[PDB]
Design a protein around this ligand. Structure first.
Ligand SMILES: Cc1cc2nc3c(=O)[nH]c(=O)nc-3n(C[C@H](O)[C@H](O)[C@H](O)COP(=O)(O)O)c2cc1C
Ligand code: SF4
Ligand code: SF4
Ligand code: SF4
Ligand code: FES
Ligand code: FES
Lengths: 164, 121, 139, 435, 115, 239
């Protein structure tokens, strides 16, 4: 029996991605970036390929690598660029063309997707493998009965009994 | 064995020591840590209201400081910010025990003070 | 080894889990993120939030997946009407005394309570009584 | 196969000195049949006593009715490095129930011998008794009986000259009805607030200090030597199937002769109350409702009460419970809504608050009931109250949520007409100013 | 829906508590907010600016605010000779609110039956 | 929780503060040490409740912060657990009370018997309500839950703190009318000892009752266990 989030449009997005002929397309390095028509200096900067780690504020795990096949969770970012403030108001002033386009739009299911995207676009890229979460607990308090086992202070000594 | 650590012998830089943000009595212990942002540092501003208010106009802090605390029967008070609840703030339930005219409970939404002489005092 | 990895079923899915694992951990291995409030990875099992209640075959009561050990051959259900009913009731019991402090609360936007209420809770309240007022503390 | 039950003979009553009319020292108890042939009964064997208790079919008198013979066998028959504990629940904070108080005040020797027999039959190295804190004179009598038994060699090393070693210690609470639960009592005993644990694990698997421990009611323990001495066959001679034996009954309320009396099981309420209690104040026709099992079980109206028997398997099918077999009687001049509201207020004050649903819903239930009492409520809010009761029930850590939810459930189910009449009637004293 | 304005309570204290719902909801990105705790422990703004040359007057800010702090006043004749005069700060918004409070309160006494 | 204790946190007072001074008496220390022997040394924390109670009589009927500190230092445990236990149990009073502590059950079986009438009589005579104390520091009124004396309801328990731990008395007074409780209070005031238990019968044996909470109406009916006590007997254990 197969059941992997089998009650949504995502299946319709699973297929039409594996269409024969359409699934064999390939482009060379920097080739897609030529088709972009953007200024050529865009490819000179460095980019970070990664998945953001789970925030400490919440126990939520949806926007994490745990549901990797469910949602595209690989992000491409750029080095932040010079920023300053408006003399008249104090608002943050900057000239970065690539300021937010990645953190808002660029989302990928696997790291290899972003690798191919950068290669076909010519963006030099860094890979940062996210740390794996640990599910195995500690030896102490391993089970609910460990909160009240004998390991806390050892076996009770029967020396204070009447007649000892 | 395990001797105590002398906290008073620790050297403290004078410049940093004299710019710690302290607070009036208000809603907290007097002189506790006050959260501050980087705004006003370039202009060398160490007052919250001075960041946005200009001149010797009456500040909202002075306005609310002119309202005497309110005496209400019971242990829990309900604050709406207006006579009709829908025209003010969300309803707040504020503890009244252990509160006096000297040490009342101030509204977190509106800043109004309340107290009750019902907790056996 | 004497089968250190035992087998259970969660919503008719066979999942291999280590011995001594909980139903919470099994559902985590099943790809389900059960709502929870008191359990933490690095802490002991508290099990007072009642938000981890799930349904198991041959069990008339909801069981504490944050605390219930998994037995071989166990069946776990997470989408039954009683599961959602219990989740909504627990959220309602959470929110009845909670002060309406979201506009002034700093955790608004990253509040587990708020998101869990949005997902596993209802939209309306039938509580119209006076709440419990708690004085703040200095630490 | 007898079909009519009741009329228990005095010569068959287990507790001959339930009122303290006789001497309370060890000489009187020994002359009254207690501490008789104790050593030889011990020498019979662990499995022999287990079998004798299993044949009796005696149920746990704490309020659950579990078969004690299977209960006492749950302790392991091997040794692994941990000592075995026996603990007796002697709080009796259930409203309407005052039988264990009488047992501890007037018949402590029977309880001590039952403790020794239970420890022998389960291998508990030492014993502990958790008495209610307010029961100070009862505690003093228990301590006196324990010291007297020690003085004659009944307790300690070589118990009664049998080779087994048994110890008994006394602890008293500090005013918490929550401590009446097994795990909560263990927790208070450990030196913490009486906040219960979760099952699994079990006290027999992991109990006090992580050691095997069985928690038992005072009444269940006390009757054991008499059952052992007089026979499981004699014990089974009373009651219906799976409901054999006698029971101590506490009758209160609007009763002509309130009393704590011993009687055969399965006796009808009408027989049990009209006789041995003088009937209802103002007559049986003045009866309105009765809670037959303390305060946690659903109450029954006059129609259900007239005809039903005092049995675990008779009150359960009536959507009620035998509970502690404590009788509370209310007449027609009584405000039933006020009674249930006061019970809810008591439960609200008694909830430990460890888990969310009970902790947060006791006050909600109390306020709902209080508004119902003044009639400041609506018809659909009754169904809302029932929905809330369903919300709490079976969703908490311990059964105290069920104990608080059940009385209002039966109240609604059997007197929804009274509540709606009150709700409408408030309009005759509240809507006249709205117009 | 006219000129945005900041409202107070009748004792004189600002209604805005810097919950930043208005900035979050604003699709015009015309609201800039900075805030910290006041010297009395009160949670108040340190910078409250709305760009009228950028504000679209949608009123979604007035819909989002749960304390009736930000309101679009009945003032609509506020054209200026320079664009800089329309860069509304906290002080000018408070001035506008103090000016137009009575009319706004009267309108709310009507709109409350619908809002 | 109970009456007269509205706070679960410490409150500063010249009487009760961090500077409060308390020390056990030699008899109290001996009694506590004897109580200590009831539990294994590696589980020495289990005796906290009786020690707290004994300290409560020793101080005069309530527990101070310094007393809690001394108890914690005696049992070698953190003060936080001691504070939790003290705030967890009803009998433990954290505030100064009168010489005598009056506790009334408010549970429904007691309520039906006329509990509010007894409370009203106490209020009218002693002049104080629940959570209050007389100006002379003589009587302290409090409300309690079911005290396990429902067959003799209504009932009242009064605690004595005028004679310390060795002279501590916790006496039940049952089957009461307003006249009964008023006369009991007056006898206590004049220095006499009111009789314990019921005011119209010995124990829970069948007798009359209190009709309407104001008058005792004796009634005659069948009573059990009126014959000679049964002789010792045991069956044949063999087969
Ligand atoms: C809220 C609550 C209060 C209880 N109070 C008592 C009690 O006061 N005395 C008692 O013997 N059992 C009490 N019990 C039952 C105990 O949990 C447990 O079942 C009992 O000690 C076992 O007695 P048994 O051996 O007769 O079955 C209470 C249970 C609950 C849920
Ligand atoms: S049901 Fe109530 S008393 Fe029982 S554990 Fe939960 S909160 Fe505590
Ligand atoms: S104006 Fe209203 S919505 Fe905007 S920050 Fe202030 S209180 Fe929040
Ligand atoms: S009216 Fe619309 S554009 Fe103007 S500040 Fe409010 S949300 Fe922004
Ligand atoms: S995680 Fe707290 S009840 Fe399950
Ligand atoms: S009802 Fe008052 S002692 Fe039980």
């Amino acid at each position: 029996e197969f059941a992997t989030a089998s009650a949504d449009y995502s299946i319709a997005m699973k297929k039409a991605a594996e269409i024969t002929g359409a699934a064999e397309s390939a482009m060379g390095p920097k080739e897609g970036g030529f088709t972009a028509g953007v200024p050529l200096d865009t490819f000179t900067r460095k980019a970070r390929i990664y998945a953001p780690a789970r925030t400490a504020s919440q126990s939520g795990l949806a926007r994490t690598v745990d549901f990797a096949t469910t949602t595209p969770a690989w992000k491409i970012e750029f080095e932040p660029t010079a920023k300053w403030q408006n003399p008249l108001m104090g608002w943050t002033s900057s000239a970065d063309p690539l300021e937010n386009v990645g953190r808002s739009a660029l989302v990928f299911y696997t790291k290899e997707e972003a690798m191919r995207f950068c290669e076909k676009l010519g963006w030099e890229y860094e890979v940062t493998e996210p740390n794996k979460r640990r599910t195995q607990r500690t030896k102490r308090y391993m089970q609910y009965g460990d909160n009240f086992g004998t390991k806390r202070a050892g076996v009770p000594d029967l020396s204070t009994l009447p007649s000892n | 064995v395990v001797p105590t650590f002398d906290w008073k012998k620790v050297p403290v830089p004078s410049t940093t020591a004299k710019d710690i943000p302290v607070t009036v009595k208000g809603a907290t212990p007097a002189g506790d840590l006050r959260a501050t942002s980087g705004l006003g540092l370039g202009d060398g501003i160490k007052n919250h209201t001075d960041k946005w208010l200009d001149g010797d106009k009456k500040s909202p802090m002075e306005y609310i400081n002119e309202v005497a605390p309110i005496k209400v029967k019971g242990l829990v008070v309900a604050s709406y910010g207006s006579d009709d609840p829908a025209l003010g703030c969300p309803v707040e339930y504020i503890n009244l025990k252990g509160t006096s005219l000297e040490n009342p409970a101030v509204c977190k939404y509106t800043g109004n003070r309340y107290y009750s002489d019902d907790w056996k005092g | 080894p004497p089968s250190d990895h035992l087998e259970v079923f969660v919503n008719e899915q066979p999942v291999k889990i280590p011995k001594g694992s909980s139903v919470l951990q099994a559902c985590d291995a099943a790809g389900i993120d059960i709502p929870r409030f008191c359990y933490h990875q690095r802490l002991s099992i508290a099990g007072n939030c009642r938000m981890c209640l799930v349904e198991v075959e041959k069990v008339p009561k909801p069981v504490a997946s944050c605390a219930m050990p998994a037995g071989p051959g166990m069946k776990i259900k997470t989408e039954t009407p009683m599961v959602k009913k219990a989740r909504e009731g627990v959220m309602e019991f959470l929110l009845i005394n909670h002060p309406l402090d979201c506009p002034i609360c700093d955790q608004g936007g990253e509040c587990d309570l708020q998101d869990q209420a949005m997902i596993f809770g209802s939209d309306r309240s039938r509580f119209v009584e006076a709440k419990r007022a708690v004085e703040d503390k200095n630490l | 196969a007898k079909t009519s039950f009741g009329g228990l003979k005095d010569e068959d009553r287990i507790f001959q000195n339930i009122y303290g009319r006789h001497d309370l020292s060890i000489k009187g108890a020994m002359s009254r049949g207690d501490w008789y042939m104790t050593k030889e009964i011990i020498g019979k064997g662990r499995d022999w006593i287990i079998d004798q208790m299993k044949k009796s079919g005696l149920r746990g008198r704490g309020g659950a009715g579990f078969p004690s013979g299977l209960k006492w066998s749950f302790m392991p028959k091997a040794s692994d490095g941990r000592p075995s504990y026996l603990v007796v629940n002697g709080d009796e904070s259930e409203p309407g129930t005052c039988k264990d108080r009488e047992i501890m005040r007037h018949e402590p020797h029977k309880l001590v011998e039952g403790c020794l027999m239970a420890g022998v039959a389960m291998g508990a190295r030492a014993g502990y008794i958790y008495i209610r804190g307010e029961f100070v004179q009862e505690r003093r009598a228990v301590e006196r009986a324990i010291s007297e038994a020690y003085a004659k060699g009944f307790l300690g090393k070589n118990a009664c000259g049998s080779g087994v070693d048994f110890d008994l210690m006394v602890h008293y609470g500090a005013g918490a009805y929550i401590c009446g639960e097994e795990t909560a009592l263990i927790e208070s005993l450990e030196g913490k607030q009486g906040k219960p644990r979760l099952k699994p694990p079990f006290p027999a698997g992991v109990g006090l200090y992580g050691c095997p421990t069985t928690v038992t009611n005072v009444e269940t323990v006390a009757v054991s030597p008499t059952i052992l001495r007089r026979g499981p066959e004699w014990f089974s001679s009373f009651g219906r199937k799976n409901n054999a034996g006698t029971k101590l009954f506490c009758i209160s309320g609007h009763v002509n002769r309130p009393v704590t009396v011993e009687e055969e099981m399965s006796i009808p309420l009408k027989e049990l109350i009209e006789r041995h209690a003088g009937g209802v104040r103002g007559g049986w026709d003045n009866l309105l409702a009765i809670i037959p099992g303390g305060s946690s079980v659903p109450l029954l109206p006059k129609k259900i009460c007239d005809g039903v028997l005092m049995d675990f398997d008779a009150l359960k099918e009536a959507q009620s419970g035998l509970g502690t077999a404590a009788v509370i009687v209310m007449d027609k001049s009584t405000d039933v809504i006020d009674a249930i509201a006061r019970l809810s207020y008591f439960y609200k004050h008694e909830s430990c608050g460890q888990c969310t649903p009970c902790r947060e819903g006791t006050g909600w239930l109390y306020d709902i009931m209080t508004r119902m009492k003044k009639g400041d409520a609506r018809l659909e809010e009754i169904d809302m109250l029932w929905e809330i009761t369903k919300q709490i029930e079976g969703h908490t850590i311990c059964a105290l949520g069920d104990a608080a939810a059940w009385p209002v459930q039966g109240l609604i189910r059997h007197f929804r007409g009274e509540m709606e009449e009150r709700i409408k009637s408030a309009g005759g004293k509240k809507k006249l100013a709205a117009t | 829906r006219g000129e945005h304005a900041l409202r107070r309570y009748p004792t004189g204290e600002e209604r805005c508590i810097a919950c930043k719902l208005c900035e979050a909801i604003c699709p015009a990105q015309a609201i800039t907010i900075e805030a910290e705790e006041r010297e009395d422990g009160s949670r108040r703004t340190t910078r409250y600016d709305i760009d009228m040359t950028k504000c679209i007057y949608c009123g979604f800010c007035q819909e989002a605010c749960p304390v009736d702090a930000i309101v679009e006043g009945p003032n609509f004749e506020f054209s200026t000779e320079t664009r800089e005069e329309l860069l509304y700060d906290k002080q000018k918004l408070l001035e506008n609110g103090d000016k137009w409070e009575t009319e706004i309160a009267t309108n709310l006494r009507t709109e409350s039956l619908y809002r | 929780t109970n009456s007269t204790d509205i706070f679960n946190i410490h409150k500063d007072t010249p009487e009760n503060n961090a500077a409060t001074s308390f020390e056990f008496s030699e008899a109290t220390l001996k009694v506590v040490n004897d109580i200590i022997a009831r539990y294994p040394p590696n589980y020495k924390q289990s005796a906290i409740i009786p020690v707290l109670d004994v300290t409560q009589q020793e101080n005069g009927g309530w527990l101070s912060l310094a007393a809690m500190n001394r108890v914690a230092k005696l049992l070698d445990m953190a003060p936080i657990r001691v504070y939790e236990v003290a705030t967890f149990y009803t009998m433990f009073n954290r505030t100064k009370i009168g010489k005598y502590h009056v506790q009334i059950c408010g549970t429904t079986p007691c309520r039906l018997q006329g509990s509010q009438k007894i409370e009203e009589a106490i209020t009218k005579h002693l002049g104080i309500g629940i959570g209050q104390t007389t100006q002379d520091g003589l009587f302290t009124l409090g409300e309690m839950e079911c005290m396990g004396a429902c067959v003799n309801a209504p009932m009242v328990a009064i605690a004595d703190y005028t004679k310390g731990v060795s002279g501590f008395e916790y006496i039940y007074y049952e089957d009461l009318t307003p006249k009964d409780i008023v006369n009991i209070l007056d006898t206590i005031k004049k220095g006499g000892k009111p009789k314990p238990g019921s005011q119209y019968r010995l124990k829970a044996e069948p007798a009359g009752a209190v009709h309407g909470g104001e008058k005792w109406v004796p009634k005659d009916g069948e009573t059990t266990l009126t014959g000679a006590p049964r002789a010792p007997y045991c069956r044949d254990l063999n087969a």
